[PDB]
């Protein structure tokens, strides 16, 4: 079924197949009505125009609410397999098969097309009711099939005889490809084919003289191979319109990003473009780019991106130069270049000002924090602080925003969490973002919906209620990851959870091997901290604390200046507390534990309050004053069983007291 591919603005052989089907359905002589699902799989990809920005926008409208079958490749083998499935589909399948056999000439093609325009297609409904004398079903222009057939009619009267010959030379090539196929052998003889073929072949007006030599014209052109064939220019094996190519490509990249498709056929066919249709179809370049990132090829990613943004900008009259840099900026942030991405972004701001268009500034601002969300360590380097944006976007407008406010509040929630604000405000801020996101369609805005889950899971986990987190985590998508953050980040993130479990099950060999990968990998900041946090926990289990103690303090000291992450500061502080008290000297930590207790009492996070209580209890029992420790733990035992993961520590301490 493979062959050279070329974009054609004329009637592709695939197109006639629908025209074959619609003829049988409207004729109503055979009583064969093609099922509606068949048409909606065939015509709909040919419906024009979808558009798909390279990055900076993911499936904002491409996702169909109902799952649709993949678009069909223009090969008789694939087309027939759709009709073939039904028990009576053989009858429908043979109807198509017979018509393709009856159509043996360019004139016969014209007979089909003249028939539809004169009788089947009709300008408007008001003439339906007057045409009750028609033995065939009549079509309205505005209908689903009507608008399609109008386009097909237009594409036939649009060209000279030069295009009509290409239709027939290609169709016979297209028809004969199916002939040397195993399925055609299964349908070598079906008697019904002759019946349907003779239905339309009738009224030939000659059977004795012209038919003797009519065959001679057909056969001589055809490759009878008795002699050397008539030499003709190389002809393409498959012809598709631009719009049909758009559907197959968009489905392929979406399927790749996260009823069976034919990846090999699509990829092979897309590799035979004459390099001119590639100009007419710039999206072929980016299809390599998405493939390029998968194997982590740097230069091969770059040239493709530059390739895509040169043909797109010229084709579209609106200035998209202000969009090219951001995609390139995303690409650099994808390879952790970071600093180079920074320079890329600044000149995007200047370009936006010259265009003097307001709507693009919202797009450039929204990209800022999305970048800083991945790399919070770069907040100081931007010319605008994060808080300025939130204040700006909160009062941006009251209309023509839709998703901006949903984006606006989530950034405040993240900042509010990191700034360790009081839980009352954080709950309210997340409330705003939750209400606005769910109010509109959440399925269509798949990116933000996932981000909501991540924040909520994180938020409730910090409060210590895994029961709530357990419900939400089932909605978190794995391996989906997000844009502008690498491509193997999901693999790394999954691996880290493995290491933590391995640490719990005392699999020191596996975790040890993973830390070796740590020092030479390019990792995101959030990933970096986890491994940085992973190492200190591992060193505690081994027993060496001189190295860890010098290591933990460096981490927390740099966890307060470079990034003002209070949550990660807390987790590191308590590890140091564990290190001290484990070495029989936790008394040094008494100043440190107390200053956090009253500090978090004001905050009101119960999980924080309880964990320090256990540490306070543990230090008091290694002193020899376990008497009062028992008294304190007795009064607070009720409120400390609410948190699951501390129960194991809480239970274990109980037998110690006995």
């Amino acid at each position: 079924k493979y062959g050279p591919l070329g974009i054609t603005n004329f009637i592709t052989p695939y197109d006639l197949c629908i025209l074959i089907l619609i003829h049988a359905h409207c004729s109503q002589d055979n009583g064969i009505s093609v099922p509606t699902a068949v048409f909606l799989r065939l015509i709909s990809p040919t419906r024009p125009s979808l558009e798909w920005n390279p990055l900076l926008k993911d499936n904002s409208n491409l996702r169909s609410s109902s799952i649709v079958p993949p678009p069909v490749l223009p090969i008789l083998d694939n087309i027939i397999r759709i009709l073939l499935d039904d028990k009576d589909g053989n009858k429908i399948a043979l109807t198509l098969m017979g018509y393709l056999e009856a159509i043996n000439g360019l004139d016969s093609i014209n007979r089909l097309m003249m028939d539809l325009e004169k009788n089947c297609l009709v300008n408007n409904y008001r003439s339906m009711k007057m045409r009750t004398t028609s033995t065939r079903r009549q079509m309205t222009r505005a209908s689903f099939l009507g608008t399609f057939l109008s386009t097909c009619i237009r594409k036939y009267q649009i060209g000279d005889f030069e295009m009509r010959e290409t239709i027939w030379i290609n169709l016979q090539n297209f028809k004969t490809v199916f002939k040397h196929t195993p399925l055609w052998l299964r349908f070598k003889d079906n008697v019904h084919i002759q019946k349907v073929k003779n239905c339309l072949l009738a009224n030939d007006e000659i059977s004795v003289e012209d038919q003797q030599m009519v065959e001679f014209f057909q056969h001589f052109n055809n490759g009878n191979d008795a002699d050397s064939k008539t030499m003709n220019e190389e002809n393409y094996g498959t012809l598709i319109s631009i719009q049909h190519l758009q559907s197959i490509v968009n489905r392929q990249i979406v399927n790749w990003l996260d009823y069976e498709e034919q990846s090999g056929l699509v990829f092979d066919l897309l590799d035979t473009l004459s390099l001119n249709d590639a100009t007419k179809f710039p999206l072929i370049f980016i299809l390599k780019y998405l493939e390029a990132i998968k194997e982590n090829s740097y230069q091969t990613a770059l040239d493709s991106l530059h390739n895509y943004f040169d043909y797109k900008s010229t084709g579209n009259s609106q200035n998209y130069f202000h969009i090219s840099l951001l995609s390139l900026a995303t690409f650099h942030s994808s390879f952790n270049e970071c600093d180079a991405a920074i320079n890329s972004f600044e000149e995007a701001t200047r370009i936006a000002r010259e265009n003097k268009d307001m709507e693009t500034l919202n797009l450039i601002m929204i990209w800022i924090i999305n970048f800083i969300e991945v790399h919070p360590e770069y907040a100081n380097r931007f010319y605008i602080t994060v808080e300025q944006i939130i204040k700006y976007l909160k009062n941006s407008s009251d209309v023509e925003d839709a998703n901006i406010f949903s984006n606006a509040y989530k950034f405040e929630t993240l900042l509010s969490m990191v700034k360790e604000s009081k839980t009352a405000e954080v709950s309210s801020s997340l409330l705003k973002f939750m209400a606005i996101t769910l109010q509109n369609v959440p399925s269509q805005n798949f990116d933000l919906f996932q981000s909501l889950v991540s924040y909520e899971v994180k938020f409730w986990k910090e409060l210590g209620y895994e029961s709530i987190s357990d419900v939400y985590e089932k909605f978190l998508s794995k391996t989906s990851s997000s844009s502008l953050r690498n491509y193997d980040s999901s693999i790394i993130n999954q691996d880290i959870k493995v290491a933590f479990k391995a640490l719990e099950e005392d699999d020191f060999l596996k975790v040890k091997q993973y830390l070796l990968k740590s020092e030479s990998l390019e990792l995101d900041y959030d990933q970096k901290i986890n491994l940085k946090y992973l190492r200190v926990k591992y060193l505690v289990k081994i027993g060496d604390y001189d190295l860890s103690m010098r290591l933990i303090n460096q981490y927390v000291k740099e966890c307060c200046e470079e990034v003002a992450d209070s949550n990660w500061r807390f987790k590191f502080e308590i590890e140091s507390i564990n290190v001290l008290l484990l070495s029989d000297v936790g008394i040094r930590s008494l100043p440190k534990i107390i200053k956090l207790i009253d500090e978090y009492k004001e905050i009101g996070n119960p999980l924080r309050c309880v964990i320090l209580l256990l540490k306070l209890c543990e230090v008091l029992i290694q002193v020899g004053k376990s008497m009062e420790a028992e008294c304190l733990i007795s009064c607070n035992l009720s409120t400390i069983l609410e948190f699951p993961f501390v129960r194991k520590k809480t239970d274990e301490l109980l037998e110690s007291l006995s």
Binding site: N9, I158, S317, Q318, V399, A402, A435
Partner: protein, 96 residues
């Protein structure tokens, strides 16, 4: 693209609280006449991208009557000093 107003809730609250230049592309430029194609309507610009099929559709539609509208104006037969463009204008006044 709900614009925050297609949302029933926030739209309700707002009521209570109240109380493009075109530039040619390469494919637009043709080989015969150096004037580039100018699209007739914004429908022919597909998200700003000039659809090549619609462009050539209008081009065919313009040229098709051009063969028919040939004999108008300048061409004059001999023995008739009066071209056919005014043969129908007098013909129009004849019945009217």
């Amino acid at each position: 693209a709900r614009a925050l107003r297609d949302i029933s809730l926030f739209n309700d609250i707002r009521k209570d609280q109240n109380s493009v230049k075109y530039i040619p592309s390469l494919s637009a430029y043709n080989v015969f006449n150096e004037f580039p194609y100018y699209p007739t309507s914004a429908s022919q610009l597909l998200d700003g991208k000039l659809d090549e099929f619609l462009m050539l559709s209008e081009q065919y539609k313009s040229r098709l009557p051009k063969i028919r509208k040939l004999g108008w104006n300048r061409f004059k037969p001999i023995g008739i000093n009066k071209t056919m463009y005014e043969l129908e204008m007098l013909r129009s006044r004849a019945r009217a």
